[PDB]
Design a protein around this ligand. Sequence first.
Ligand SMILES: NC(=O)c1cccnc1
Ligand SMILES: [Ca+2]
Length: 223
Amino acid sequence: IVGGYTCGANTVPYQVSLNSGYHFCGGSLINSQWVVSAAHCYKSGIQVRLGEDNINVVEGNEQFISASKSIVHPSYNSNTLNNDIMLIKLKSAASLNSRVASISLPTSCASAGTQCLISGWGNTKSSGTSYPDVLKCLKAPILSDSSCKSAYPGQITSNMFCAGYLEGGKDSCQGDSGGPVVCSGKLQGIVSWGSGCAQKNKPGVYTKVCNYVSWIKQTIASN
Ligand SMILES: NC(=O)c1cccnc1
Ligand SMILES: [Ca+2]
């Protein structure tokens, strides 16, 4: 996250870190045994880390649980990033409390104008690299589809939305991928892609979660 703020320990209780010996992507806990993240984050051998603030220090509220199954969306296209969403089932159910909690799926799509919270342990610089050890947060509005499409001609599908600032300076970035975009207490987006980070006229692009609720529910019910 570029241009954000330190969230505070366990203030974003649904945020997870995907670990393969190191943090590589974010995710969101949607129930005691399932996590949603971006398909481009797919890897074998994932350990899901819940209850994290500092990812390099054991602070006392962590739960580390191995994934038992990963399901990439059936129509994921790695070249266009269309349908950038995947589900991860945990080997065992997480213990749910004030600091480890699920986030609700939306029943309606959010509108441009709506303010959302984006979070992650990704790069904090637009030029150069600095990875934080503690969770960073950013409040950003959903942008109109027209401004989104104008910023990225020929690249925005019906399964994506833009959020952020056209002036720049504030955005998600590498390492935040797979993480949550939460608006009005619902999961509306997944950190997906963006041309550099926090660049003028190049806002972040997020997977539209409201288009996938039926898929998510059906998949969970049978796996
Ligand atoms: N610019 C961005 O928001 C972004 C997000 C994820 C990966 N790369 C860039
Ligand atoms: Ca920790």
